[PDB]
Amino acid sequence: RTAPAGGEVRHLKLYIEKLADGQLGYGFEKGRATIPGPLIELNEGDTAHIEVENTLDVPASLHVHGLDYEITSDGTKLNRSDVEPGGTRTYTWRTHAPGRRADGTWRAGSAGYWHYHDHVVGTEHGTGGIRKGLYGPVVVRRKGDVLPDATHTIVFNDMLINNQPAHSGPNFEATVGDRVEFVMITHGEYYHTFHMHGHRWADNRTGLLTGPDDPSQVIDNKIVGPADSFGFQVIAGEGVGAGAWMYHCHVQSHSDMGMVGLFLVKKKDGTIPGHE
Amino acid sequence: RTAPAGGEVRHLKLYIEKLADGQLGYGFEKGRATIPGPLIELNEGDTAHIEVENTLDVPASLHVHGLDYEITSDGTKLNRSDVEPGGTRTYTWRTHAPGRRADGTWRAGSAGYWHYHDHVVGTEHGTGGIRKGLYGPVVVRRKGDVLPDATHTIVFNDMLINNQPAHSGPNFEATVGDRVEFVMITHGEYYHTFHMHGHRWADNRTGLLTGPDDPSQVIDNKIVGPADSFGFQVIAGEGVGAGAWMYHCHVQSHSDMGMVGLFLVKKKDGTIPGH
Amino acid sequence: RTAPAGGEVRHLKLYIEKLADGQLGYGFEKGRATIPGPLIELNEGDTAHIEVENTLDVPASLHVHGLDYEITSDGTKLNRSDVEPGGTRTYTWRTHAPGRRADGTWRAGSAGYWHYHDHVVGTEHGTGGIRKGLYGPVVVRRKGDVLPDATHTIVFNDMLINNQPAHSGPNFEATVGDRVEFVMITHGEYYHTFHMHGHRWADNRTGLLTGPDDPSQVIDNKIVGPADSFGFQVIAGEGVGAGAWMYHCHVQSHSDMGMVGLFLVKKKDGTIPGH
Ligand SMILES: [Cl-]
Ligand SMILES: [Cl-]
Ligand SMILES: [Cl-]
Ligand SMILES: [Cl-]
Ligand SMILES: [Cl-]
Ligand SMILES: [Cl-]
Ligand SMILES: [Cu+2]
Ligand SMILES: [Cu+2]
Ligand SMILES: [Cu+2]
Ligand SMILES: [Cu+2]
Ligand SMILES: [Cu+2]
Ligand SMILES: [Cu+2]
Ligand SMILES: [Cu+2]
Ligand SMILES: [Cu+2]
Ligand SMILES: [Cu+2]
């Protein structure tokens, strides 16, 4: 499939909750909060009204990367955009399509791989909040953008993936030939380098090449640092066939200390070449 | 407006001098130096002759990124390009437009977001000199490149912004609809992530999509290490509006430790919604 | 001169062996294996069968970036691709050209600057093998790609360039007007920024602008991290003349610690400006 034009206006509830293990999360539902928070997909031109209810005991906020929002939706202590504890506040994210300005210049669309995260917990930059798991993927499609069969989010949050314990995964699961979207986010103090076995992508907006004239580098290794966001797609097993395809931070310490996961690509039999 | 064709020759005089302690600037007039140094603005094809007088009591130099210079302008003790204390030397920067070679291959233009820094003070790679603030923005335009209303230079130097103490800014002030050009330069030991609230830019030469077919990633956040140089223009408050829009390093401790500042975008009447 | 279309089948023999002190390397020749390991060049579509012979007494393997390889050629302990001590094993790399997919999307080719390295020695991720010098360049070319006169590989491995001691270089040699290719691979714990004096390139697959309409920023400085891989081509001293043009890591304490070397560009004379 390809994505349609936007303009639709969505109403979402987002709850800021303490998880059973004392972590923090966004969720569409009271008690259902996940780390990472839920995926939010918009099409260019869409508008999202998110009413945030903060159940914590500390002021918490909602900040987004790359979408259009006014100073009142900033999510910051600075701009008085945060949510006092047991409070609720509606955030408004806006999105626009590429086009020409009055002078003739080209205006860049909102489309890309983005993320939302808390800006007020533990410090005025959300250091406490980010550490404890308040973050999530935001994806903005452009009219005509190829769409996946699945999206998977991997956040390198300091030394952990998705605030999972070391050597935890996650593993993701696909069958040969599915189109698989990967959204990569990074947080904390450290730089990483993201690697995937048996697959490669294009370093550009969509991780997909236009046609024969796209100069973009093809790479299976991309260095990243806190709050970077990118994504790409893959045809699973393309040319490499089924199996367990490792993905990991390539900083050698981080890898040995367990920032690793598995991309389990299955034969159409739903069978996988025998692994460890 | 837009950048015209280059080829004009320029003469400029740079002084290397101490200001406060732990700080050494470049400046166009004696006593007038700053951190960062003056912006040098060229069009592709222009030549820069820069007269440099070293008022420091140790050797200092001029070394530039991306522009053409011969070995004699290198800026290094290696190539004996340094400036003796109290002395003077004239550097040369050439610049060229893109074009076909004889073999028919494409030779790239000089244009881009570049910078100069001292290569000999405190070490042979200018460790001492860079730390104390000898660095500056160099911007070379391609004919047809858009010109900004204002240009602002944001340098991340180790843990400080433009060698300003934590939480001291700098702030940057514009008005909605202004085309504000930023040039971002990193120096020192550490990588960073430069981020800005409410705005975005292309990841490419000019930081501006050439049109609908530009594949470049649109981004509000970029990893950068020492000597990295990039630039872009935004329409101030475009799609977002008046407000005091943070920029900062996104490394968690970095932003908490005071690498923070404001792009302060006013209304047409001077209004910033209260903060 | 330009690369042709691929599709050949290749057979290459690689020896993992222990070098003079505690050091490990890949080699074509039994006994003279080098750090970094031998350059492997391919045209898009080339199929390469590589026999590996492991002369060490711990397991060891071969793992490549970007090329098509099946799970049995992974080079890992979990996918059961590691080579027992004394044993030999054949790894298959495969390559393909770009073209319209079944769904009419454009499938990316394999062309680019890649590397191989060890995924087994000392850890599941080969930290010890990589540290000890098991790593080396791969270059996959597209039909039409411009060929160089010479190819140099610079590897940043932790704090050492190509496993040489600090301040030992390597230095590379060229005549003005040479078309010189540099492959740059990074490994270890650290990030660097690769700087080159008097020479600039384009950030993209080949390092060279495909024409006037390639938006890619032009750079002399690029931040990199473990397993990152790129490469480019310059014309020796184009616009800047002969001389000794430093290259180095521009992380300031890394410069000082000796990640530094020379691009020595001679006149057709054979003469070089002094340094
Ligand atoms: Cl709705
Ligand atoms: Cl989700
Ligand atoms: Cl023009
Ligand atoms: Cl410090
Ligand atoms: Cl590091
Ligand atoms: Cl020289
Ligand atoms: Cu912020
Ligand atoms: Cu890591
Ligand atoms: Cu953020
Ligand atoms: Cu791996
Ligand atoms: Cu240098
Ligand atoms: Cu920082
Ligand atoms: Cu420099
Ligand atoms: Cu370094
Ligand atoms: Cu690798």
CA distance C132 to A80: 54
**What is the C-alpha to C-alpha distance for residues C259 and C266, in angstroms, rounded to an integer?**
23
* Residue C239 forms contact with B (CB below 8 Å): yes
Same domain, C183 and C258: yes
Ramachandran quadrant class, B7 (left: phi over 0; alpha: psi -120 to 50; beta: rest): left
Question: B160 and B92 in one domain?
Answer: no
DSSP B261: E
The tokens of B97 are what? 């437009």
Please give the torsion angle defined by the CA atoms of residues C117, C204, B105 and C218, in that order, rounded to the nearest 10 degrees.
-120
Residues B19 and B128 in one domain: yes
Residue C225 · residue A251 · CB < 8 Å = yes
Q: Is B197 annotated as a binding residue?
A: yes
Contact criterion met (CB below 8 Å) for C52 and C14: yes
- DSSP assignment, residue B143? T
Listed in sequence order, the residues at least 6 apart from B225 whose beta carbon sits closer than 8 Å to its beta carbon are B186, B190, B191, B192, C191, C192, C193, C223, C250, C251
For strands B243-249 and B260-266, give the pairing. Answer: antiparallel
Picking from C186, C149, A175, the residue whose alpha carbon sits closest to that of residue B103 is C149
Residue after which a domain boundary falls, among B145, B175, B201: B145
Q: How was this structure determined?
A: X-ray
Q: Are residues C167 and C83 in the same domain?
A: no
Q: Pairing between strand B243-249 and B192-196?
A: antiparallel
Q: Of A79, A130, A225, which has the smallest distance from its Cβ to B191's Cβ?
A: A225
CA atoms of A64 and A78, how far apart (whole Å): 15
Among the partner residues A70, A226, A227, nearest to B240 by beta-carbon distance: A70
Give B252's DSSP letter.
H
Same domain? C67 vs C164: no
Give contacts of B 96-125 with C, CB under 8 A: 96, 98, 105-113, 123-125
Q: Are residues B108 and B235 in the same domain?
A: no
The closest ligand to the CA of A13 turns out to be 1
Beta bridge partners of C235: C179
C269 plus C225 within the same structural domain: yes
- Chosen domain end from B98, B121, B145: B145
Write the residues followed by a gap in chain C (C–N more than 2.5 A). none
Residues C187 and C115 in one domain: no
Are residues C153 and C141 part of one domain?
A: no
Q: Are B219 and A66 an interchain contact pair (Cβ–Cβ within 8 Å)?
A: yes
Instruction: Tell if the CB–CB gap between C197 and B74 is shorter than 8 Å.
Output: yes
Residues of C in contact with B194 (CB under 8 A): none
Two tokens at C238? 């184009």
Read off the CATH number of the domain in which A120 is found. 2.60.40.420
Residues of chain B positioned with their CB less than 8 A from the CB of A131: 252
| B71 at C interface, C-beta within 8 A | yes
What is the per-residue burial (b if ≥16 Cβ within 10 Å, else e) of A111-123? bbbbbbbbbbbbb
**Same domain, residue pair C198 and C173:** yes
C253/B127 touch (CB, cutoff 8 Å), yes or no: yes
Q: Best of B69, B93, B115, B125 to disrupt the C interface by mutation (most C CBs within 10 Å)?
A: B125
A159 CA → ligand 2 middle, Å: 22
| B127 vs C202, C242, C256: nearest CB | C256
DSSP 8-class letter at B23: -
Residue A127 touches partner B, C-beta closer than 8 Å = yes
Contact at 8 Å (CB) between A212 and B238? no
Residues C253 and C152 in one domain: yes
Chain A residues 161-220 within an 8 A CB cutoff of chain C = 191-193, 195, 197-198, 200-202, 208-220
CB contact under 8 A, A71 and B240: yes
Quote the CA–CA distance of A80 and C5 in Å, as a whole number. 61
Number of domains in chain B: 2
Ligand 10 centroid to Cα of residue A16, in Å, is: 36
Asked if A26 contacts A50 with a C-beta cutoff of 8 angstroms, the reply is no
Asked if C241 lies within 8 A of B111 by C-beta distance, the reply is no
CA gap B268, A227 in Å, rounded: 32
Cα torsion A266, A267, A270, A273: sign: negative
Helical spans, DSSP H, in chain C: 127-131, 252-256
Residue B142 burial (CB count, 10 A)? 21
Helices (H), chain B: 127-131, 252-256
Contact B54, B127 (CB under 8 A): no
| Shared-domain flag, residues C28 and C139 | yes
From C79, C111, C145, the end of a domain falls on: C145
- For A175, what's the count of Cα atoms within 13 Å in the CB-facing half-sphere? 6
Beta-carbon neighbour count of residue C208 at 10 Å? 21
Alpha-carbon span C262 to C275, nearest angstrom: 11
CB neighbour burial string for A135-151, b if at least 16 within 10 angstroms, e if fewer? bbbbbbbbbebbebeeb
Identify which of A265, A121, A94, C241 has the alpha carbon closest to the alpha carbon of residue B68: C241
Q: Which residues of B45-60 are buried (b: 16+ CB within 10 A; e: fewer)?
A: bbbbebebbbbbebbb
For residue A31, the one-letter residue type is G
Establish, for the pair of chains B and C, how many residue pairs have beta carbons separated by less than 8 Å.
127
Which structural domain, as residue segments, surrounds residue A18? 1-145
Contact with chain C for residue A269, Cβ under 8 A: no
